[PDB]
Short mmCIF file of C-alpha atoms in Angstrom, two decimals:
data_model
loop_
_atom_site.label_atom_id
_atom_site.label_comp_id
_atom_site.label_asym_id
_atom_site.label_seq_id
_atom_site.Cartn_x
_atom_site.Cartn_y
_atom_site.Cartn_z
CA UNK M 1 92.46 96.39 119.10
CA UNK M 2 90.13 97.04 115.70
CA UNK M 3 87.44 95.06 114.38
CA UNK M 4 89.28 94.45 111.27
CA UNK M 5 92.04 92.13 112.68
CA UNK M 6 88.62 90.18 113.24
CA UNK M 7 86.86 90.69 110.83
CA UNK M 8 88.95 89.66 107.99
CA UNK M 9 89.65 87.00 110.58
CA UNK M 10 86.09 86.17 110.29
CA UNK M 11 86.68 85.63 106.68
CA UNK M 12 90.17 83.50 107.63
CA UNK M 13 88.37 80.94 110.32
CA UNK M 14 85.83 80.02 107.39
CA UNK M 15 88.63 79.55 105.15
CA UNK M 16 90.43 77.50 107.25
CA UNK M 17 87.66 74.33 107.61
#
């Protein structure tokens, strides 16, 4: 699973407004 495909994900849901 990872914590990166959610972390830079976490970066990608604020970038998406």
């Amino acid at each position: 699973a990872m914590r990166l495909s959610k972390f830079f994900r976490d970066f990608i849901l604020q970038r998406k407004k």
